[PDB]
Write a protein that binds this ligand. Structure first.
Ligand SMILES: C[C@@H]1O[C@@H](C[C@H]2C[C@@H](CO)O[C@@H](O)C2)[C@@H](O)[C@H](O)[C@@H]1O
Ligand SMILES: C[C@@H]1O[C@@H](C[C@H]2C[C@@H](CO)O[C@@H](O)C2)[C@@H](O)[C@H](O)[C@@H]1O
Ligand SMILES: C[C@@H]1O[C@@H](C[C@H]2C[C@@H](CO)O[C@@H](O)C2)[C@@H](O)[C@H](O)[C@@H]1O
Ligand SMILES: C[C@@H]1O[C@@H](C[C@H]2C[C@@H](CO)O[C@@H](O)C2)[C@@H](O)[C@H](O)[C@@H]1O
Ligand SMILES: C[C@@H]1O[C@@H](C[C@H]2C[C@@H](CO)O[C@@H](O)C2)[C@@H](O)[C@H](O)[C@@H]1O
Ligand SMILES: C[C@@H]1O[C@@H](C[C@H]2C[C@@H](CO)O[C@@H](O)C2)[C@@H](O)[C@H](O)[C@@H]1O
Ligand SMILES: C[C@@H]1O[C@@H](C[C@H]2C[C@@H](CO)O[C@@H](O)C2)[C@@H](O)[C@H](O)[C@@H]1O
Ligand SMILES: C[C@@H]1O[C@@H](C[C@H]2C[C@@H](CO)O[C@@H](O)C2)[C@@H](O)[C@H](O)[C@@H]1O
Ligand SMILES: C[C@@H]1O[C@@H](C[C@H]2C[C@@H](CO)O[C@@H](O)C2)[C@@H](O)[C@H](O)[C@@H]1O
Ligand SMILES: C[C@@H]1O[C@@H](C[C@H]2C[C@@H](CO)O[C@@H](O)C2)[C@@H](O)[C@H](O)[C@@H]1O
Ligand SMILES: C[C@@H]1O[C@@H](C[C@H]2C[C@@H](CO)O[C@@H](O)C2)[C@@H](O)[C@H](O)[C@@H]1O
Ligand SMILES: C[C@@H]1O[C@@H](C[C@H]2C[C@@H](CO)O[C@@H](O)C2)[C@@H](O)[C@H](O)[C@@H]1O
Ligand SMILES: [Cl-]
Lengths: 342, 344
C-alpha cells in the first residue's frame, strides 16, 4: 500500500525548447513556471495559476502540434484536462473526460498523433481513453485493460510504435502490457517481469531503441531491467539506498543518468560512463535537502536540469555546468504532493 | 543549374544506427548501415535494393520506425520501397504514379501520415500523402502551383504545419505552408527574396524557428530564419561568408549548436559552427581536408557526434566524424556512387 516519495512537478520541453514545470499549490490549483529563454540558467517566469482543483499529480504532455495539455484527477475522481488552444499560447478552461480513476494519469502519443491516457480505475484495473483524431477531441470511450495494479502506471512507446504500460502488481512485481500493433485497441495479456518494486516504475527508451525500466527495490537500491533487442534481461541492481522515486534522463550523448533522494535527504546520482552502452558509475552526492523525488530533464543546451521541492516547500533547481553542477537555487512557490497514490 | 548535390540520403534508424542510401553505377538504390549504434561502428558494406532510379533516393523514417525510400523511376513516376518491419526486410518497389521532375521531399504530418512533395512537368509543386499513419493506400496527387527551379525542401514547423521551400523563376527563395497541421489547405506562394544558387537546406532550431541555408550569387553560405517560433516575420538574409563549390549540409550538435558543411574552392570539406550555444555567433570557416566530389551529408549519430559523408575522387563514399577535440582521419566505405539528382 506504499511507494517511494513522488516527484513534485511534471516537466516538459516546450515547442520552442524551454523547460516548463507543473505542480500543485496550497489552493489545490495547478500552477506552472517556465524559463524565459531556451538556455541553462535562464531567468524563470515565476509561478502562475491554471486554477482547477486537483486530487492527483498534474501531468503535462506535448501534443504533436506543440500544444501542451495537462491531465489531472479532479475532485469528483474523473479525469480532467486543460490545453493550450494554440501552440505555446493561451489555455482552455478545464474540462472533464469523465471516468473514475484512482491513480495519477500517464500519457503518450500514438504514432498517429492521438494522445492516449492510462490510469488505475475504481476497480483497481488499468483503464484508458484516447483522442479520436490527432491532437484533438472528441475523446473515445473509456476502456479497460484489466489487471490489478498497486502503483501509478507508466507508459512509453517502443521503437516500433507500440505503446507499453508498466505498473506494480498485487504481488509487488513489475508487470507490463503492450499494444500488438501501433495505434491499436488490441493489447497483449498482462505479463510479469518479476522482482519486487517499492516505487513507481520509470521507463526510458534507450538510444538503441530498447525499453528500460528503473524502480526502487525491496532493499531500497535502484534496480533496472531492459528489453534485450529493440522493441527481457534479468533484473540488475545499480545499488544506492534511495528514499524517493528515481528520475532518469539522457545526457547530450545519450548516456543515462539516474537521480534520487538519499537517506541524508540530499540529491544523489549515478551515470553511464563512456557511452550510452557503458557501465554505470558509483553514486555521488549533489547536496541539497529535498522533500520530494527529483525531476530530471535535458534542456535546449544539452545540459541536465534537476528540480526538487526544498525544506521551505519551494521548487529548487540545480544543473550541469562545464565540469560540475550548479549551486541549488530557489524558484520559489509553495508546492504540495497531491499524488493519488503515496 | 544548382550547386553540386549531396550524393546520399542518411537517417538515424529507430535503433540508433546510421544508414545511407545512394545510387550505384547500375542505377539501383544501394545502402550501407552501421552494425552498432556508436561513432566509428563497423559498416555492413554496400548492398542493393534494386530498382532503376532517375533522382536522388530519399529515405524517411515512418512514425512506427520503418524506413521508406522514395525515388523517381524510369517512367518518371514516384516510386517507393519500405521495410515490412523495423528490423526486417524490404517490400518490392511499388509505383505511386504521377510524373515528376525533381527529387522527392518527404515529411511526416502530426498525424503520422507521410507527405511527399515533388516538382511536376508543369514546374509546379505537387504533393501526395498516406491516407492513414505510416500506411497505404495513398491519396491522389494534387498541385500547390507555383513555378520552381530547384528541388523542393520540406520541414515541419514547431506548431505542426508543413512548409515547403524552393528556388523560383526569379532565383529568389520562395515558400508555401499548411494553414493547419494535417491540412490540405495551404497559403499562397510567397517570396523570401535573395538569390540562391543551391537547393535550400531547412532546419528547425532548438527554439522552434525554421532556418534556411543556401549558397548565394557570391557563392558564400547564406541563411535566413523565422524570427518567432513557427511564425513570420522572417529575418533578412545574412551571410556566413566562405566560398563554396557544393550545396551546404547542416546538422545539430547534441547541444543544438548548428554546424554547416560544404565543399571548398580547394575541394576539401570545410565547416563553420555556432559557438557557445545554439543562439551564439558562428565561427570562421575551417578545413576538414579530404578531396571530395559531391556535397557533404551531415548527421548526428547515437553518441551525439556529427558524422559527415562525401563522395571521394575514386567515387567511393568517404567518412569523417567528430572526436573529443578534433575530427577523425577520412576513411573509405567503398562502393561506386553516381549523382542521380533529377535537377542539376
Ligand atoms: C504554487 C503557489 O505558490 C505560492 C504563490 C507564489 C506566487 C508568486 C507571485 O509572484 O510568488 C511566489 O513566490 C509565490 C502560494 O501562495 C500559492 O498558494 C501556490 O501554492
Ligand atoms: C480539475 C477540476 O477543477 C475544478 C474545475 C473548475 C475550475 C474553474 C476555474 O475557473 O472553472 C470551472 O469551469 C471548472 C473542479 O470544480 C472540478 O471538480 C475538477 O476538480
Ligand atoms: C498486474 C497483475 O494483475 C493481475 C493478473 C492478471 C492476469 C491476467 C491473465 O492473463 O488476467 C487479468 O485480468 C488478471 C494480478 O492477479 C497480478 O497479481 C498483478 O497484479
Ligand atoms: C527488483 C529486485 O527484485 C528482487 C530480486 C530479483 C533478483 C533476480 C535475479 O537477479 O531474480 C528475481 O526473481 C528477483 C528483490 O529481492 C530485490 O530487493 C529487488 O526488489
Ligand atoms: C542515494 C545514496 O545511496 C548510497 C548511500 O550511501 C547514500 O547515503 C544515499 O542514500
Ligand atoms: C533544496 C534546498 O537545499 C538546502 C540549501 C542548499 C543551499 C546551497 C547553497 O548554494 O548549498 C547546498 O549544499 C544546500 C536547504 O537549506 C533549502 O531549504 C532547500 O531545501
Ligand atoms: C554502389 C555499388 O558499388 C559497387 C559495388 C560494391 C560492392 C561491395 C561488395 O558487395 O564492395 C564495394 O567495394 C563495391 C558497384 O560495382 C555497383 O555497380 C554500385 O555502383
Ligand atoms: C524504380 C523502378 O525500378 C524498376 C522496377 C522494379 C519492379 C520490381 C517488380 O516487383 O522489381 C524490381 O527489381 C524493379 C523500373 O522498371 C521502374 O520503371 C522504376 O524505375
Ligand atoms: C515560386 C514562384 O512561383 C510563381 C508565382 C506564384 C505566385 C502566386 C500568385 O499569387 O500564384 C502562383 O500560382 C504563382 C513565379 O512567378 C515566381 O517567380 C516563383 O517562381
Ligand atoms: C542570398 C543573397 O541574396 C542577394 C543579396 C541579399 C542581401 C540582403 C542584405 O540586406 O538583402 C536582400 O534583399 C538581398 C545576393 O546579392 C547575395 O549574393 C546572396 O545570393
Ligand atoms: C569554404 C572556404 O571558404 C573560403 C575561405 C574563408 C576562410 C576564412 C578564414 O580566412 O575567411 C572567410 O572570409 C573565407 C575559401 O578560401 C576556402 O578555400 C573554402 O572555399
Ligand atoms: C575523401 C578522400 O580524400 C583524400 C584522402 C584523405 C586521406 C587522409 C589520410 O587519412 O588525408 C587527407 O588529407 C586526404 C583522397 O585522396 C581520397 O581519394 C578521397 O577523395
Ligand atoms: Cl554528454
Amino acid at each position: 500500500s506504499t511507494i517511494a516519495l513522488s516527484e513534485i512537478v511534471s516537466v516538459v520541453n516546450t515547442s520552442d525548447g524551454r523547460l516548463e514545470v507543473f505542480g500543485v499549490g496550497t489552493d489545490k490549483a495547478v500552477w506552472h513556471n517556465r524559463q524565459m529563454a531556451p538556455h541553462t540558467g535562464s531567468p524563470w517566469s515565476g509561478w502562475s495559476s491554471l486554477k482547477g482543483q486537483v486530487t492527483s499529480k498534474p501531468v503535462v504532455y506535448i501534443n504533436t502540434d506543440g500544444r501542451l495539455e495537462v491531465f489531472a484527477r479532479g475532485t469528483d475522481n474523473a479525469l480532467w484536462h486543460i490545453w493550450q488552444t494554440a501552440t505555446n499560447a493561451g489555455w482552455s478552461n478545464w474540462q472533464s473526460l469523465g471516468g473514475v480513476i484512482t491513480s495519477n494519469p500517464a500519457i503518450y502519443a500514438n504514432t498517429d498523433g492521438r494522445l492516449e491516457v492510462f490510469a488505475r480505475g475504481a476497480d483497481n484495473a488499468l483503464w484508458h481513453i484516447s483522442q479520436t483524431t490527432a491532437h484533438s477531441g472528441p475523446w473515445s470511450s473509456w476502456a479497460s485493460l484489466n489487471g490489478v495494479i498497486t502503483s501509478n502506471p507508466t507508459v512509453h512507446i517502443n521503437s516500433d510504435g507500440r505503446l507499453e504500460v508498466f505498473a506494480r502488481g498485487t504481488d509487488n512485481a513489475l508487470w507490463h502490457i503492450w499494444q500488438t500493433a501501433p495505434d491499436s485497441n488490441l493489447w497483449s495479456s498482462w505479463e510479469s517481469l518479476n522482482g519486487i518494486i517499492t516505487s513507481d516504475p520509470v521507463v526510458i527508451d534507450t538510444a538503441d531503441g530498447r525499453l528500460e525500466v528503473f524502480a526502487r527495490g525491496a532493499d531500497n537500491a535502484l534496480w533496472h531491467i531492459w528489453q534485450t533487442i529493440s522493441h527481457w534481461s534479468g533484473w540488475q541492481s545499480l545499488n544506492g539506498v534511495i528514499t524517493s522515486a528515481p528520475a532518469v534522463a539522457k545526457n547530450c550523448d545519450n548516456r543515462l543518468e539516474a537521480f534520487a533522494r538519499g537517506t541524508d535527504n540530499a540529491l544523489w546520482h549515478t551515470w553511464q560512463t563512456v557511452s550510452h552502452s557503458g557501465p554505470w558509475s558509483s553514486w555521488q552526492s549533489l547536496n541539497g535537502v529535498i522533500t520530494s523525488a527529483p525531476t530530471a530533464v535535458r534542456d535546449a543546451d544539452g545540459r541536465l536540469e534537476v528540480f526538487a521541492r526544498g525544506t521551505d516547500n519551494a521548487l529548487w533547481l540545480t544543473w550541469q555546468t562545464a565540469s560540475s553542477w550548479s549551486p541549488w537555487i530557489s524558484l520559489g512557490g509553495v508546492l504540495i504532493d497531491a499524488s493519488a497514490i503515496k
